[PDB]
């Protein structure tokens, strides 16, 4: 009865670096953008046209989009920033190497940080550069919502209200929408809309710059999926 | 400084295909040449020299200014910023010249009703009919707008008239808020904000030109009408 169009943005300048990114404001590598556009290509070849896109307030995802909808010949789409699509919070993790991260924290529970989905990093003090409230980006947020260290569980819970909403509403309303973001908030909201285990979204995987097509019920729940490739 | 209170920033996108062509565009969804996109990465450059950063930006829904807005931001490292589209900010609509050249515009009409139709407040040029491919009724953009707001033409006084209301509930809350606004829009759009703001006559403001891709900082008072008025670039 609905459609819903997922997508994550291509590798990062840090992918390739090997590090630690989450709330990091990176940008899209130069392969990124290049996935970037073949999946906006992808989409135009299936004959897709959006009525509005919602993306993070992190530059890859909405770079990537903006490259998307400029091969869709869509570039008028309205596109929505929020931060409850932004990428899971890594803590004391980010900007680290998988190298750094084994010298200064054990290389083991560092594993534990990635592959876990109730345990967070470490936290960041508020005079580290680190520290979301120390970007303009974040200025007049809440100070609650921003993250000193999130695990995915802390992440499926702010996106959550996001999709009832905001993005839920636009759905019902027949608008045809796609959610541009990250790894992390896409999981969460596979989790969500499929009614998962916590074990069970631990095994998931999500391709980069690969659009994911959900088909929805009246209640909103996925009654199948499938990649455009 | 003392005596105003906000800063507004206005700009009106580089050169068009059709600006290349010298035809009428109006609400035509034409899009920018390169030479155009490079006039907006030069705009982003010169206000990061200044030490410009927005925290919104309102644009039209035609993608010549949505693509300097996204180049002017990017080059900005602004990208983050939130982009509010409106048709409101649309260029003047030009009825039935929109897409001639100045030998096609001189076969279908005449040269004293044309001058006219360019320079004049008050006097629109001629209609497009709802069958005519040219009207905005035609186009998947405008689907869920009401109809009413769909021109068939427009004088710079209508343009006026449907520009303000926007600025009065959208554009002034943000500013009264505290942010940091840019306007990214179109010649005519942005001659009737000026109008509005610095409380011109319609005599006033057909004198008025809007250098393209220069940014334009507007010092506002506690009445958001303009105390000041100066651009980035002497050139």
Redesign the interface.
């Known amino acids: 009865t609905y459609k819903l169009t997922l997508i994550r943005h291509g590798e990062s300048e840090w992918n390739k670096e090997n590090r630690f990114t989450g709330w990091t404001?990176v940008s899209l590598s130069e392969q990124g953008v290049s996935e970037a556009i073949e999946a906006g290509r992808m989409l135009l070849e299936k004959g897709f046209?959006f009525d509005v896109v919602y993306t993070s307030?992190?530059?890859r995802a909405?770079?990537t989009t903006?490259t998307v909808l400029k091969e869709l010949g869509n570039?008028?789409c309205?596109?929505?920033?929020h931060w409850r699509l932004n990428e899971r919070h890594y803590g004391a993790l980010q900007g680290l190497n998988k190298s750094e991260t084994a010298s200064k924290f054990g290389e083991d529970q560092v594993k534990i940080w990635r592959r876990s989905f109730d345990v967070p990093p470490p936290v960041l003090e508020k005079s580290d550069p680190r520290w979301p409230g120390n970007e303009?980006?974040y200025?007049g947020i809440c100070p609650s919502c921003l993250p000193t260290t999130e695990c995915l569980k802390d992440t499926v819970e702010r996106v959550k209200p996001y999709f009832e909403d905001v993005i839920a509403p636009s759905i019902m309303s027949g608008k045809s929408v796609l959610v541009s973001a990250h790894g992390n908030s896409l999981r969460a909201l596979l989790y969500l809309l499929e009614g998962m285990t916590p074990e069970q979204i631990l095994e998931v995987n999500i391709p980069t710059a690969c659009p994911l097509v959900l088909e929805l019920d009246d209640y909103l729940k996925v009654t199948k999926k499938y990649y455009l490739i």
Do not use: A
């Open positions: 404001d046209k307030v992190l530059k909405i770079m903006w570039i008028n309205p596109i929505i920033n303009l980006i200025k």
